Write a protein that binds this ligand. Structure first.
Ligand code: A1B3W
Ligand code: ZN
Length: 139
């Protein structure tokens, strides 16, 4: 679990969005595993606007943060789960690091701000849905 709170927006994994997220829907994209809903309270998380390929993510299945080197956002094939059929997920960044399904939502940050959230993983890999291209999150 986990979310990003920026301005009047909440960014979560689409497959973990709640009934309230869908009732306050701003934008969603199944191919990215992202959903953004509106909030009444102001968030003040900062979104990175950069080309970093290193950062630190939070891993809830270890209660720890780990440093990572990750690939640039790209189209990656993700095997079927209970949430989606087998498909290409876009804007996904992969790195070597521990993850389990419930780690989805953990934040990846660089020195400039939030980069993205855990969205995929397995066998010593962890994948992050990028949010740095969503320029409207700041207005
Ligand atoms: C962090 O996720 C995992 C980590 C390890 C393992 Cl063995 C499996 C993990 O589950 C996943 O990769 N998915 C399940 C939920 C939906 C995901 C998606 N974005 O399509 C894919
Ligand atoms: Zn950065």
């Amino acid at each position: 679990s986990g979310a990003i709170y920026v301005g009047n927006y909440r960014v979560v994994n689409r497959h973990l969005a709640t009934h309230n997220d869908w009732a306050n829907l701003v934008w969603e994209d199944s191919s990215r595993d992202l959903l953004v809903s509106s909030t009444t309270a102001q968030g003040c998380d900062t979104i990175a606007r950069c080309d970093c390929q290193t950062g630190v993510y939070y891993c809830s299945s270890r209660r720890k943060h780990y440093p990572v080197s990750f690939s640039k956002p790209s189209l990656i094939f993700v095997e079927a789960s209970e949430y989606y059929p087998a498909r290409y997920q876009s804007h996904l960044m992969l790195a070597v690091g521990h993850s389990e399904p419930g780690d989805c939502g953990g934040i990846l940050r660089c020195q400039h701000g939030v980069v993205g959230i855990v969205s995929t993983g397995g066998n010593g890999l962890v994948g992050f849905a990028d949010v740095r291209d969503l320029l409207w999150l700041d207005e």
